[PDB]
């Protein structure tokens, strides 16, 4: 079933939690949940489009120059994405900054374009890209929410100005009247949170295996 | 199961070493506690008790034997963190520092003997980064039973809860004051002539941390530790010599901008870090040349970030950097074996 | 340089002895000292072989041979 | 336009260079990977009738003996490959695990710290 | 002066602890010291070459023709090709040399650092010399951090880390603490 | 010369003053003796006698099968009753091949082959005379003395060192053997100096034995080149590698023998045994042991025949005045736990310590704090903490790099460890695992070579026979 | 043949370049409009709408002085009579230079000061920003007439402006920048004063 890939890529093979890929945007643009959600959505869109293009162009890539071709097929698309969200989502573009342009070198994107998109049809590749993007977005949302709560208390902030007023319902506040721990926002707060998330994933995987046993 | 030798052992133990280190720290801690009054006592007690409780909880979680709580490895960390904090600091600063050290810095790596970074300095850096306002408020010396220091319940309201410290009970120290007055286009000489006395600063009559103030009782404790074979003289000697040499050279080159020698030695937590904190066995080289390199690096980094950096004191940062650099020093400066050259090849005769 | 083996099931013995080139099985066994290890060895009665083939006492032996005394 | 021509020139130059280099001269995760009881024979005193089948099927020089009623016995060179098990019509070979002796004694690892 | 710029790039603005660039191979290969050293040398050379090529391409082709938005694609494309050559040329000319640079070279074809550094240097408007020095300094900082982290992880491998934290999670926590330690160099240069 | 300074070392409680007062005692003949056939290093000797034979004091019961071995002589006249399994002085407690001799009680000497003017013959004759005596180097290493002397003769020896610096705590056998028999030791040193053409002998004793120093100086004052030296009171000082450094000043190269620096080391008991064998022809039959500890009524030094059960020695010194906790065969720093009191006394047995509870330390292992007190005490200048870390993780190959090859298992590691860690136990376990792997590889190589040779010879024989048969049928 | 690889790479590059140029010609005007709108939004926080009629970011007249160097004065003329001038100032703080914006009216009264770029220590001297504290709103009616050259300092130096608890260098820098801006406006009359 084609839907197997979409569910399998969520937790069994996570880009940032299992394969140890896409760590730069995971650790950099995570100080707010909205930043993580926007980066995840952009990465998912780029992954879907690049996977579809590569699979449609599968039987045309020379074996020895495979990278500089496919990288181009990614790079230009990424450029377009920038030239989209710099024009109609400028508030989010100013926040992400360099890492919206740094999706060409995203290890997850090229890894999925090479490993799966060169030996699968267009529909399975699209579903695999969607699953990887969804998993990356979930990880980004979780880490951003944890860091934002530890640093300021609020969960999701300035979503109306960034993602549009339509998402205004997402602005919730946790721990009212809280100055927050400043270290969570800072770079030292990202590695520790990611390590704790990895440890929690290992613990829940072991407990789930025991329950299945 | 058969027993393996040897069947003889000296009179040594981790408990004795840790308790002797605490005994060496005792006189300077008493001098600090008496000088600043009740709030310092409250903060020190809270920090030590919280460190012990968190260590017990972490030992319970990991399943390690509770006897590990009786070796004094947690009480020493709490003691050093408490004497590193500002005197009239709130309780939550000490509790959070103890939680961040005993916890992430030590017990998250396995326990005693496994951590690669100094726990007390890790907690100090984390507290300074997270809460800069509470970690840059120094109380002037208000001696216990001096008719001007706050009473018992007034000190309780100062430490616990959030009663303001009023006015006239908080001032600037030496290093920060010198840097600020340098930013006020005043040369380095006039600042020290009318705002710094070496004799009073050496005794410990200046504002600062809880136990950092006195540079003489700490020296006595360090010397006593050295005579007891508990620490090695290489690290303290190297740190002090490097700081003094660099400071004296800078003073000689440009006396109107650099202050060096006695001013650098009798200011900040240089002596305490050199004797009791940079000599951490688990996070220091096990060789002799390694210890010399560790001390030289600590001294150079301390002086460089003191003078040209953005901090009035960087003993914790230098210690953390050298703890990071320690494994390479250990793996590249191993002692020579018997019957082999430095490269390890067998000798020829 | 040869070896002498006693195939006694109770205690399988094997010894290595250096002998002069062109020697005989009799002199090789005498030099090897297997007689003193087991006084119940009859060199005229029990079978003497090389690598599993019955041989003669004064037959010449080469380097790397294996004399064996068995029932 | 003057820009697409230059980009195409750069592209074809790079491609031809790569091709000529290949003539004359995956994934990140997989590339990281590249960068980074014995038994012995046993012969009883009755099941061996000197049928010399065990020596016949024993590539190692383990069984010593020939003829009949000589009670061939193994040596230390046995490996338990079993070439002599089915060889004997009377099922004489009695492969057993090696017994612990003084010369094969090693110290035990300390429990824990 | 240039020594101060190089030291500020190496310590004050480290490309990993305060830049978050090239973290995947950094966290994947730092388990062993020798691959860490090899990848450090390879990435230093690759970053220097890529910075030089990117500056030449931007200031001689892109800007004069008026097209700047293309830069990203052009940059990465050129870099990719260069890396391939630097592999194949060193996979026959010197077979012995294909054990310290050639093996780890494919790891940095798309690293986010060989592309992050040129893009950052573009915004500051560096000249050719400044761009080359910026690339080399970023490579040196990456190399030093990788070597230190490799030593730390090699020592932690033989320690009694709890079974729920041994491996990658303890590496991430150690990297966070190392960044906290490096935070003291801020404002020095 | 002038004493150098060795690196590292500890100062354990000597405990030598409670037993080095009484003279060397004597033992009544026990009923039966258990003589293991392997009391030495190298190959195991093969018995020459059968069950029920009558032997005399000095008969050669077992003879060496190869060059590196030592024969076994009958301690006393009697009848052989078993050639079978006997208990062994090992921590494991397993049995070993050995003879059982029932002491007749007459104690009649055999017709010994005495020499004539030992300072007249070539060194090789004296070397083989020592070879046919059972001298085994009563120093702990139990290496045959004949092989050592023969290897020394081929090289150039500039100094013969007598290792009289008894260093183990609780042990005083060398002290009395030098106090009472100084003349014999001096004569043996002179005989060794004649065997190995050398310059002088440098007999060394620790400074905590003033009586031994005075007696040795009084005995050797007229012979000239003989010298008596007073080495410091350090534990790892009796070791050959450390004593050579202390006396000569050089260091024995790694993976090399002591003859490289031109110095031969012999124990003070081995020298006496060599003197006895050369002068009178008496083989190595009895030695001197020390019975000490808080559990013994009267600690003493006993002249014990080889193969005497431990229980006889314990009963001789009054008896067990209390309850023991660990019975050690040797010094506390290198002793082995005796399984029972029925174990015999091999030539390598040095002591019979019976340690009480207040003499044995109580320990509680804790994680290493990296205090680096092991590095400051290791005589070989190693890093014991790293070796223990690599041995605990089963990385023996990485442990060998840090100095596991050069470790002598002296025990200075665990003696100065704040957090009590069995570092020596880890090192012994790692060395045992390495030896097991090496033995497996050696057996694999040997069996592969044997299979290749057997297959080649069988194939060539079959081909030759087939060719001969083909030639025969052609002429038919 | 090698021709296929080169042709493939060339075709990919050409198609991508064509698509990128189409996207750029589609979106560059919108990007420029967004940047201009962001600049206007930044300007509007210090200059109320009623005061100015013409476009402030169209009549920028760079002026040159003896201390600040070169400025970027934007007028806020209503019908030709200057009512306000907006410029920027830079001064060394603690963690680096601070860049702020001033909106001085035609009579010397400050209409509002905002800090654009700073690198002060968060949690200790971040109150200069208008989104966390009202301190930066102190300069709202002051001038060089009702405040002599004695109250334009922090209270540590004998002035009338409050200093942050545990931070004085940053208020010193901000007050010095404000005073220098007012003095610069006073020096250059007519064009900047009216
Ligand atoms: C995935 C790779 C990139 C491909 C991107 C695909 C998504 C692109 C979505 C483009 C959206 C088109 O929708 C675009 O909306 C903007 C909103 O400012 C409109 O722009 C509008 O700006 C202002 C504000 O309302 C109006 O005064 C103006 O008249 C109008 O042009 C455009 O007229 C319309 O073209
Ligand atoms: C799956 C989505 C992934 C997002 C990233 C991919 C780029 C997509 C670009 C095309 C987006 C068009 O998005 C649509 O545009 C309109 C204008 O027409 C935006 O409309 C709004 O955007 C901005 C966001 O800061 C608001 O501040 C502003 O008030 C308004 O212009 C909405 O956000 C959305 O309804
Ligand atoms: C290892 C030992 C750990 C010891 C842990 C002890 C924890 C409890 C400390 C004593 C209780 C403090 O209880 C705390 O009081 C504060 C202040 O009144 C209140 O806290 C409330 O106000 C404070 C700010 O003033 C903010 O955290 C927040 O707005 C809200 O939580 C709550 O009531 C409770 O968060
Ligand atoms: C909201 C919570 C988020 C948690 C985030 C961090 C994850 C931390 C969980 C892993 C922590 C490891 O800490 C501890 O590890 C030990 C391994 O010795 C596990 O195991 C321990 O407890 C279990 C019972 O539960 C015992 O059977 C076991 O012998 C003991 O070792 C513990 O269950 C875990 O608590
Ligand atoms: C073991 C208990 C827990 C100890 C740790 C927590 C202590 C918390 C202290 C909170 C202090 C509240 O603030 C403090 O309250 C105490 C009573 O509590 C007041 O104390 C008042 O009552 C006490 C008796 O109860 C009188 O003796 C005193 O003269 C009077 O001032 C102080 O005037 C006020 O400063
Ligand atoms: C970063 C490394 C260390 C991590 C430490 C773990 C976090 C420790 C708590 C950090 C909380 C910071 O937020 C801090 O919350 C405390 C409550 O504790 C508030 O404190 C408030 O309530 C407490 C009682 O609960 C009163 O004693 C205090 O006078 C009052 O201000 C502070 O006003 C606020 O600054
Ligand atoms: C056994 C260990 C030693 C135990 C000693 C305990 C007693 C310690 C008492 C000395 C500490 C306080 O004693 C003294 O107090 C006065 C106020 O009167 C402080 O203040 C004094 O010196 C400072 C200099 O900076 C100035 O403010 C001023 O000259 C004066 O007030 C001194 O800095 C402190 O030295
Ligand atoms: C600590 C162990 C290493 C010791 C190494 C010693 C090497 C150098 C020895 C010569 C040092 C001369 O050091 C010199 O001493 C003078 C006093 O005479 C000190 O100078 C001192 O007095 C001057 C005014 O007279 C003050 O402004 C100054 O702040 C104070 O330090 C300086 O520190 C240095 O200028
Ligand atoms: C491992 C050993 C390393 C030794 C390092 C030796 C090099 C460092 C000392 C020389 C640099 C001195 O650096 C000098 O000091 C100041 C702070 O005082 C630095 O820093 C200054 O400028 C920077 C950049 O605007 C800002 O952070 C701020 O304005 C200020 O801190 C300057 O860049 C330089 O003027
Ligand atoms: C830990 C240790 C302790 C030793 N103790 C002694 C000792 O007490 N007396 C001694 O003569 N040699 C001692 N030695 C050295 C050897 O036991 C022995 O002298 C040498 O290896 C061979 O000597 P031999 O041939 O005389 O037996 C010791 C060696 C080591 C490693
Ligand atoms: C001489 C000495 C110095 C020590 N210094 C420190 C220190 O600076 N910080 C700390 O947390 N523990 C210190 N300790 C306690 C112990 O070394 C520390 O818990 C190790 O980090 C245990 O992991 C010290 C112990 C000794 C014996
Ligand atoms: S095959 Fe069996 S019966 Fe025949 S010789 Fe071998 S053991 Fe004896
Ligand atoms: S098992 Fe194999 S090696 Fe062993 S005796 Fe039988 S045939 Fe020979
Ligand atoms: S036992 Fe080995 S490692 Fe330990 S001190 Fe002795 S020689 Fe050194
Ligand atoms: S003596 Fe023990 S605690 Fe000290 S370094 Fe050696 S093994 Fe570690
Ligand atoms: S290195 Fe993998 S995404 Fe940056």
Chains F and G, touching by 3 or more CB pairs within 8 angstroms: no
Residues forming beta bridges with residue F205, ordered by sequence position:
F230
Q: Distance between CA A159 and CA F191 in Å, rounded?
A: 100
| Tokens of residue C58, six digits | 């004064």
Torsion sign over Cα B143, B149, B155, B161: negative
**All domains of chain C, ordered by start, with CATH?**
2-70 (3.10.20.30)
Q: Is residue E142 part of a domain?
A: yes
Q: Are residues G34 and G61 in the same domain?
A: no
Q: Distance between CA A106 and CA E113 in Å, rounded?
A: 11
- Give the CA distances from residue B288 to residues B230, B232, C2, in Å, rounded to whole numbers and listed in that order: 15, 9, 57
When CB atoms are compared, the residue of B104, B129, B131 closest to A186 is B129
Mutate to test the interface with B, among E184, E185, E186 (most CBs of B within 10 A): E184
Q: Distance between CA F412 and CA F333 in Å, rounded?
A: 8
Residues F25 and F300: beta-carbon distance below 8 Å: yes
Q: Distance between CA F371 and CA F365 in Å, rounded?
A: 15
Q: Are residues G78 and G161 in the same domain?
A: yes
Ligand minimally distant from the alpha carbon of residue E16: 16
Experimental method: cryo-EM
Phi, then psi, of F253 in degrees rounded to 5: -60, 145
The two beta strands, C2-6 and C13-17, are antiparallel
Ligand minimally distant from the alpha carbon of residue D50: 12
When CB atoms are compared, the residue of G20, G95, G96 closest to E70 is G20
Chains touching C by CB (3 or more pairs below 8 Å): D, F
Q: Are residues G19 and G39 in the same domain?
A: yes
Number of neighbours of residue G138 by Cβ within 10 angstroms: 17
- Gap sites in chain B (C to N > 2.5 Å), preceding residue numbers: none
Residues F384 and F77: beta-carbon distance below 8 Å: no
Delimit the CATH 3.40.50.11540 region(s) of chain F. Answer: 32-287
State which of B296, B302, B308, B312 you would mutate to test the pocket of ligand 9, scoring each by most atoms of that ligand within 8 A of its C-beta: B308
- What's the number of domains chain B is made of? 2
Q: How far is CA G27 from the centre of its chain?
A: 27
Residue of minimum CA distance from atom 1 in ligand 12: D88
Q: What is the DSSP annotation of A121-153?
A: -HHHHHHHHHHHHHHHHHHHHHHHHHHHHHHTS
Residues of G in contact with E187 (CB under 8 A): 95-96
Q: Is residue B346 part of a domain?
A: no
Place of tokens 């007023």: A165
To the question of whether residue F159 is assigned a binding role by annotation, the answer is no
SS3 E166: coil
Question: Given phi > 0 = left and psi -120 to 50 = alpha, else beta, which region is B122?
Answer: alpha
Q: Are residues B70 and B142 in the same domain?
A: yes
Residues D61 and F451: beta-carbon distance below 8 Å: yes
Q: Distance between CA G39 and CA G105 in Å, rounded?
A: 20
For residue B75, give the nearest of B96, B48, B95 by alpha carbon: B48
Cβ-defined contact of B1 to D107 (cutoff 8 Å): no
Phi, then psi, of D53 in degrees rounded to 5: -75, -30
Place of tokens 């019955």: C54
When CB atoms are compared, the residue of A61, A90, A182 closest to G34 is A90
Q: Are residues B163 and B184 in the same domain?
A: no
N- to C-terminal Cα separation, chain E? 12
Dihedral, D15, D21, D27, D28 alpha carbons, nearest 10? -110
Residues F288 and F303: beta-carbon distance below 8 Å: yes
Cβ-defined contact of E162 to B110 (cutoff 8 Å): yes
To the question of whether residue F413 is assigned a binding role by annotation, the answer is yes
For residue F331, give the nearest of F172, F168, F206, F175 by alpha carbon: F168
Residue of minimum CA distance from atom 4 in ligand 15: F371
Q: How far is CA B281 from the centre of its chain?
A: 14
- Give the CA distances from residue C59 to residues A88, C18, C19, C45, in Å, rounded to whole numbers and listed in that order: 106, 17, 14, 17
User: String of b and e for B224-257 (b: at least 16 CB within 10 Å)?
Assistant: ebbeeebbbbbbbebbbebbbebbeebbeeeeee
CA of A143 to the centre of ligand 11 (A): 33
Residues forming beta bridges with residue F206, ordered by sequence position:
F231
Residues of E in contact with D32 (CB under 8 A): 25, 28-29, 107
Q: Distance between CA G147 and CA D7 in Å, rounded?
A: 64
Class at the top of the CATH hierarchy for domain F364-476: mainly alpha
HSE on the CB side for E118, CA within 13 Å?
Answer: 28
Residues B204 and B213: beta-carbon distance below 8 Å: yes
- What's the number of domains chain G is made of? 2
What single DSSP character describes residue F161? E
Q: Are residues B59 and B194 in the same domain?
A: no
Burial class (CB in 10 A: 0-12, 13-18, 19+), E136: buried
SS3 F409: coil
- Give the CA distances from residue F310 to residues B5, E180, F199, G109, in Å, rounded to whole numbers and listed in that order: 20, 65, 42, 109
Residues of F in contact with D110 (CB under 8 A): 365, 392, 422, 425-426, 429
Chains E and D, touching by 3 or more CB pairs within 8 angstroms: yes
Q: What is the DSSP annotation of E127-149?
A: -HHHHHHHHHHHHHHHHHHHHHH
Q: Distance between CA D66 and CA D50 in Å, rounded?
A: 6
Number of neighbours of residue D3 by Cβ within 10 angstroms: 16
CA of B63 to the centre of ligand 4 (A): 9
Domain carrying residue E162: 16-183
For residue F343, give the nearest of F316, F317, F307 by alpha carbon: F307
Check if D55 contacts F (Cβ < 8 Å). Answer: no
Ligand minimally distant from the alpha carbon of residue F351: 10
Say what the resolution is, in angstroms. Answer: 3.4
Place of tokens 């029990």: C46
Q: Distance between CA F279 and CA F116 in Å, rounded?
A: 8
The two beta strands, F159-163 and F263-267, are parallel
Domain carrying residue A66: 3-212
- Give the CA distances from residue F64 to residues B223, C16, G86, in Å, rounded to whole numbers and listed in that order: 63, 12, 109
Residues A129 and A46: beta-carbon distance below 8 Å: no
Residues forming beta bridges with residue G100, ordered by sequence position:
G89, G115
Q: Is residue E3 part of a domain?
A: no
Question: Given phi > 0 = left and psi -120 to 50 = alpha, else beta, which region is A211?
Answer: alpha
Residues D39 and D80: beta-carbon distance below 8 Å: yes
| Tokens of residue F88, six digits | 């062994």
To the nearest whole Å, the CA of F342 is away from the closest chain B CA by 18
Number of H helices, E strands in chain C: 2, 5
Q: Distance between CA B82 and CA G116 in Å, rounded?
A: 40
To the question of whether residue G25 is assigned a binding role by annotation, the answer is no
Question: Given phi > 0 = left and psi -120 to 50 = alpha, else beta, which region is G158?
Answer: left
- Give the CA distances from residue B97 to residues A175, B50, B120, B296, in Å, rounded to whole numbers and listed in that order: 22, 9, 8, 28
Place of tokens 């901000």: G174
Residues of G in contact with D20 (CB under 8 A): 2
Q: Is residue E125 part of a domain?
A: yes
Q: Distance between CA F84 and CA F314 in Å, rounded?
A: 26
Domain carrying residue G180: 52-192
To the question of whether residue G42 is assigned a binding role by annotation, the answer is no
Q: Are residues G115 and G87 in the same domain?
A: yes
CA of B92 to the centre of ligand 6 (A): 6
Residues D53 and D26: beta-carbon distance below 8 Å: no
Alpha-helical regions (H) of F27-68: none
SS3 E154: helix
Check if D31 contacts A (Cβ < 8 Å). Answer: no
Q: Is residue E188 part of a domain?
A: no
Residues forming beta bridges with residue G64, ordered by sequence position:
G70
- Give the CA distances from residue C40 to residues C5, F45, F48, F129, G74, in Å, rounded to whole numbers and listed in that order: 15, 19, 12, 30, 125
To the nearest whole Å, the CA of B80 is away from the closest chain E CA by 18
To the question of whether residue G83 is assigned a binding role by annotation, the answer is no
Q: Are residues G57 and G19 in the same domain?
A: no
Q: What is the DSSP annotation of G52-104?
A: --S-GGG--B--B-SSS-B--BEE--SSSS--EEEEEEEEE-SSSEEEEEEEE
| Tokens of residue D107, six digits | 């110290």
State which of B77, B98, B323, B326 you would mutate to test the pocket of ligand 11, scoring each by most atoms of that ligand within 8 A of its C-beta: B77
Q: What is the DSSP annotation of chain G?
A: -HHHHHHHHHHHHHHHHHHHHHHHHHHHHHHHHHHHHHHHHHHHTTS-GGG--S-GGG--B--B-SSS-B--BEE--SSSS--EEEEEEEEE-SSSEEEEEEEEETTS-EEEEEEEE--PPTTTSGGGSTTT-SGGGS-SS--SSSS-TTSSSBGGGTSSB--BTTB-HHHHHHHHHHHHHHHHHHHS-GGGT-
Q: Distance between CA B16 and CA F257 in Å, rounded?
A: 43
State which of E15, E23, E142 you would mutate to test the pocket of ligand 16, scoring each by most atoms of that ligand within 8 A of its C-beta: E23
Chains touching E by CB (3 or more pairs below 8 Å): A, B, D, F, G
- Give the CA distances from residue D4 to residues A72, A75, E69, F197, in Å, rounded to whole numbers and listed in that order: 15, 17, 14, 94
The two beta strands, C13-17 and C66-70, are unpaired
Residues of B in contact with D113 (CB under 8 A): none
Rg (CA), chain F: 25
Check if A20 contacts D (Cβ < 8 Å). Answer: yes
Question: Does domain F32-287 correspond to CATH entry 3.40.630.30?
Answer: no
Q: Sheet holding G97-105: strands in order across?
A: G74-75, G84-92, G97-105, G110-117
Question: Given phi > 0 = left and psi -120 to 50 = alpha, else beta, which region is A156?
Answer: left
Torsion sign over Cα A159, A162, A166, A167: negative
Domain boundaries, chain D: 37-99
Q: D28: Cβ–Cβ under 8 A, 6 or more apart, which residues?
A: A21, A107, A110, A111, E24, E25, E28, E107
Alpha-helical regions (H) of F91-249: 123-131, 145-154, 173-180, 182-195, 210-219, 240-247
Q: How far is CA A12 from the centre of its chain?
A: 16
Q: What CATH fold (topology level) applies to the domain D37-99?
A: Alpha-Beta Plaits (3.30.70)
Q: Quick check: CB of F417 below 6 Å from ligand 14?
A: no
Q: Are residues G38 and G105 in the same domain?
A: no
| Tokens of residue F315, six digits | 């009963």
Mutate to test the interface with A, among E115, E169, E174, E180 (most CBs of A within 10 A): E169
Ligand minimally distant from the alpha carbon of residue B147: 7
Q: A76: Cβ–Cβ under 8 A, 6 or more apart, which residues?
A: E73, G16, G17, G19, G20
Q: Is residue B347 part of a domain?
A: no
Q: Is residue E2 part of a domain?
A: no
Residues of D in contact with B2 (CB under 8 A): 108
Residue of minimum CA distance from atom 16 in ligand 4: B62
Q: Distance between CA B333 and CA E34 in Å, rounded?
A: 18
Domain carrying residue B104: 13-170
Cβ-defined contact of F457 to C51 (cutoff 8 Å): yes
When CB atoms are compared, the residue of E22, E173, E183 closest to A195 is E173
Residues F424 and B5: beta-carbon distance below 8 Å: yes
Place of tokens 């008896």: F319
Helix (H) or strand (E) segment spanning residue C35: helix C34-37
Q: Distance between CA D108 and CA D111 in Å, rounded?
A: 9
Q: Are residues B180 and B112 in the same domain?
A: no
CA of B75 to the centre of ligand 11 (A): 10
Residues of G in contact with E73 (CB under 8 A): 13, 16, 20
Q: Distance between CA B304 and CA B264 in Å, rounded?
A: 12
């Amino acid at each position: 079933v084609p839907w197997q890939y979409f569910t399998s890529a969520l937790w069994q093979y996570n880009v940032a939690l299992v394969q140890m890929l896409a760590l730069c945007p995971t650790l950099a643009v995570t100080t707010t949940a909205t930043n993580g959600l926007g980066m995840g959505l952009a990465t998912t869109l780029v992954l879907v489009m690049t996977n579809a293009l590569i699979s449609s162009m599968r039987h045309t890539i020379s074996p020895e120059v495979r990278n500089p071709v496919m990288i181009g097929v990614i790079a230009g698309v990424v450029t377009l994405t920038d030239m989209a969200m710099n024009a109609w989502m400028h508030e989010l573009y100013k926040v992400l900054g360099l890492f919206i342009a740094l999706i060409v070198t995203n290890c997850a994107v090229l890894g999925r374009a090479e490993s799966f998109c060169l030996r699968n049809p267009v529909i399975p590749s699209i579903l695999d890209g969607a699953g990887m993007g969804a998993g990356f977005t979930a990880v980004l949302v979780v880490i951003g929410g944890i860091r934002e709560i530890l640093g300021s208390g609020t969960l999701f902030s300035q979503a109306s100005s960034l993602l549009g007023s339509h998402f205004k319902w997402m602005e919730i506040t946790v721990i009212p009247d809280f100055q927050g721990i400043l270290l969570a926002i800072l770079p030292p707060g990202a590695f520790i949170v990611l390590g704790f998330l990895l440890a929690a994933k290992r613990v829940i995987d072991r407990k789930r295996a025991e329950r299945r046993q | 199961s058969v027993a393996a030798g040897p069947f003889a052992h000296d009179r040594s133990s981790v408990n004795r070493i840790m308790l002797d280190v605490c005994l060496a720290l005792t006189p300077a801690t008493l001098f600090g506690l008496v000088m600043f009054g009740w709030p310092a006592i409250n903060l020190w007690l809270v920090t030590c008790v919280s460190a012990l409780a968190i260590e017990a909880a972490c030992l319970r979680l990991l399943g390690q034997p509770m006897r590990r709580l009786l070796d004094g490895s947690a009480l020493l960390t709490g003691w050093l963190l408490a004497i590193s904090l500002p005197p009239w600091a709130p309780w939550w600063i000490g509790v959070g520092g103890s939680l961040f050290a005993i916890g992430i810095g030590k017990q998250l790596y396995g326990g005693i003997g496994q951590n690669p970074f100094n726990p007390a300095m890790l907690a100090r850096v984390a507290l300074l980064i997270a809460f800069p306002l509470q970690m840059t408020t120094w109380a002037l010396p208000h001696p216990l039973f001096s008719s001007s220091a706050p009473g018992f319940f007034d000190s309780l309201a100062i430490t616990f809860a959030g009663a303001p410290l009023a006015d006239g009970m908080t001032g600037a120290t030496a290093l920060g004051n010198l840097k600020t007055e340098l930013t006020l286009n005043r040369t380095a000489q006039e600042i020290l002539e009318g705002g710094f006395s070496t004799i009073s600063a050496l005794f410990g009559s200046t504002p600062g941390s809880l136990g950092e103030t006195s540079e003489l009782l700490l020296l006595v404790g360090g010397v006593w530790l050295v005579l007891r074979r508990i620490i090695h003289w290489e690290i303290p000697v190297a740190i002090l010599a490097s700081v003094f040499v660099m400071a004296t050279l800078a003073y000689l080159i440009n006396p109107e901008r650099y202050a060096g020698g006695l001013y650098q030695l009798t200011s900040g937590g240089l002596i305490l870090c050199a004797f009791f904190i940079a000599t951490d066995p688990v996070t220091s080289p096990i060789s002799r040349v390694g210890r010399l390199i560790f001390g030289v690096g600590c001294g150079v980094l301390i002086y460089v970030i003191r003078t040209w950096g953005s901090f009035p004191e960087a003993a914790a940062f230098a210690v953390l950097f050298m703890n990071a650099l320690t494994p390479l020093i250990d793996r590249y400066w191993r002692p020579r074996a018997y019957g082999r050259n430095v490269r390890g090849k067998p000798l020829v005769a | 340089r040869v070896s002498v083996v006693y195939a006694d099931p109770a205690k399988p013995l094997q010894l290595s002895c250096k002998v002069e080139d062109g020697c005989s099985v009799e002199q090789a066994i005498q030099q090897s000292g297997v007689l003193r290890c087991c006084p119940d060895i009859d060199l005229k009665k029990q079978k003497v072989g090389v690598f599993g083939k019955f041989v003669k006492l004064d037959s010449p032996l080469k380097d790397g041979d294996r004399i064996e005394i068995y029932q | 336009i003057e820009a697409t021509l230059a980009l195409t020139v750069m592209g074809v130059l790079l491609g031809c260079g790569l091709g000529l280099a290949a003539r004359k001269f995956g994934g990140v995760g997989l590339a990281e990977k590249l960068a980074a009881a014995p038994m012995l024979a046993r012969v009883e005193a009755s099941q061996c009738i000197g049928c010399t089948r065990c020596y016949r099927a024993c590539p190692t020089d383990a069984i010593v003996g020939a003829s009949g009623q000589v009670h061939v016995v193994l040596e230390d060179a046995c490996t338990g490959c079993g070439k002599c098990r089915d060889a004997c019509p009377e099922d004489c070979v009695l492969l057993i695990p090696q017994e612990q002796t003084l010369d094969t004694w090693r110290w035990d690892k300390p429990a824990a710290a | 002066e240039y020594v101060l710029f190089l030291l500020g790039t190496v310590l004050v603005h480290n490309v990993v602890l305060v830049g978050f660039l090239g973290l995947c191979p950094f966290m994947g290969v730092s388990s062993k010291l020798d691959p860490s050293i090899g990848l450090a040398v390879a990435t230093t050379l690759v970053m220097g070459l890529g910075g030089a090529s990117s500056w030449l391409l931007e200031h001689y082709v892109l800007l004069p023709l008026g097209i700047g938005f293309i830069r990203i694609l052009a940059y990465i494309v050129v870099i990719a090709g260069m890396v391939q050559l630097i592999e194949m040329i060193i996979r026959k000319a010197s077979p012995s040399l294909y054990r310290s640079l050639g093996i780890y070279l494919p790891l940095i074809t798309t690293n986010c650092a060989v592309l992050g550094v040129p893009l950052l240097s573009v915004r500051e408007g560096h000249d050719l010399t400044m761009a080359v020095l910026f690339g080399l300094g970023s490579g040196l900082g990456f190399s030093l951090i990788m070597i230190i982290f490799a030593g730390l992880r090699e020592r932690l491998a033989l320690a009694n880390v709890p079974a729920a934290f041994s491996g990658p999670p303890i590496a991430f926590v150690t990297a966070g603490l190392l960044a906290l330690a490096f935070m003291g160099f801020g404002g020095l240069i | 010369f002038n004493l150098s300074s060795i690196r590292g070392g500890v100062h354990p409680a000597a405990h030598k003053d409670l037993s080095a007062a009484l003279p060397i005692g004597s033992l009544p003949l026990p009923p039966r003796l258990y003589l293991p056939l392997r009391q030495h290093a190298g190959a195991e000797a093969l018995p020459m006698v059968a069950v029920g034979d009558k032997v005399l004091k000095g008969q050669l019961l077992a003879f060496p099968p190869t060059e590196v071995s030592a024969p076994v002589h009958a301690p006393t006249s009697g009848r052989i009753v078993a050639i079978g399994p006997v208990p062994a002085p090992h921590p494991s407690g397993l049995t070993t091949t050995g003879i059982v001799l029932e002491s007749d009680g007459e104690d009649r000497w055999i017709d010994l082959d005495v020499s004539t003017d030992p300072f007249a013959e070539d060194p090789l004759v004296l070397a083989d005379r020592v070879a046919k005596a059972g001298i085994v180097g009563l120093g702990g290493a139990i290496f045959p003395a004949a092989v050592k002397l023969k290897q020394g003769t081929r090289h150039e020896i500039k100094t013969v060192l007598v290792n009289g610096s008894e260093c183990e705590p609780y042990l005083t056998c060398d002290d009395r053997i030098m106090r009472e028999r100084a003349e014999a030791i001096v004569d043996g040193a002179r005989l060794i100096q004649h065997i190995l053409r050398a310059y002088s002998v440098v007999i060394a004793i620790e400074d905590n034995k003033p009586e031994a120093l005075a007696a040795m100086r009084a005995a050797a004052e007229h012979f000239g080149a003989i010298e008596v030296m007073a080495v410091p009171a350090l534990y790892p000082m009796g070791s050959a590698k450390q004593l050579i450094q202390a006396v000569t000043g050089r260091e024995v190269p790694a993976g090399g023998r002591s003859t490289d620096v031109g110095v031969l080391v012999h124990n003070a008991g081995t020298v006496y045994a060599i003197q006895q064998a050369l002068r009178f022809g008496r083989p190595l039959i009895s030695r001197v042991v020390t019975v000490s500890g808080a559990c013994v009524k009267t600690p003493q030094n006993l002249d014990v025949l080889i193969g005497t059960p431990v229980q006889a020695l314990i009963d001789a010194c009054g008896g067990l005045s209390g309850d023991p906790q660990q019975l050690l065969l040797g010094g506390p720093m290198m002793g082995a736990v005796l399984p029972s009191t029925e174990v015999p006394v091999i030539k390598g047995a040095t002591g019979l310590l019976a340690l009480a509870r207040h003499e044995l330390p109580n320990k509680d292992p804790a994680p290493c704090i990296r205090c680096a007190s092991c590095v400051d005490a290791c005589p070989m200048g190693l890093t014991p903490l790293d070796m223990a870390l690599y041995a605990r993780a089963d990385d023996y190959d990485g442990a060998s790099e840090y100095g596991l090859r050069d470790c002598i298992l002296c025990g200075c590691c665990s003696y100065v460890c704040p957090s009590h860690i069995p570092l020596v136990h880890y090192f012994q376990y790692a060395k045992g695992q390495q030896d097991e792997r090496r033995s497996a590889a050696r057996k694999s190589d040997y069996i592969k070579r044997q299979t290749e040779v057997r297959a080649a010879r069988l194939a060539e024989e079959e081909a030759a026979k087939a060719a001969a048969k083909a030639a025969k049928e052609a002429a038919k | 043949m090698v021709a296929y690889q080169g042709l493939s790479l060339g075709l990919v590059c050409a198609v991508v370049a064509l698509l990128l140029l189409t996207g750029n010609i589609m979106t560059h005007g919108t990007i420029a409009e967004q940047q201009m709108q962001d600049r206007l939004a930044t300007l509007r926080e210090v200059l109320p709408q009623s005061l100015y009629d013409n476009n402030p970011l169209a009549d920028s007249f760079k002026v040159q002085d003896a201390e600040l160097g070169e400025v970027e004065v934007l007028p806020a003329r209503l019908q030709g009579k200057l009512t306000a001038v907006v410029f920027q100032g830079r001064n060394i703080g603690y963690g680096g230079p601070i860049e702020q914006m001033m909106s001085v009216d035609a009579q010397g009264k400050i209409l509002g000061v905002r800090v654009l770029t700073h690198k002060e220590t968060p949690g200790l001297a971040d109150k200069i920003e208008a989104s966390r504290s009202d301190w930066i709103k102190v300069f709202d009616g002051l001038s060089l007439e009702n405040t002599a050259l004695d109250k334009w300092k922090v209270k540590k130096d004998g002035g009338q402006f409050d200093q942050f608890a545990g931070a004085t260098i940053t208020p010193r820098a901000v007050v010095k920048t404000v005073l220098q801006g007012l003095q610069f406006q006073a020096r250059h009359a007519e064009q900047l004063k009216a």
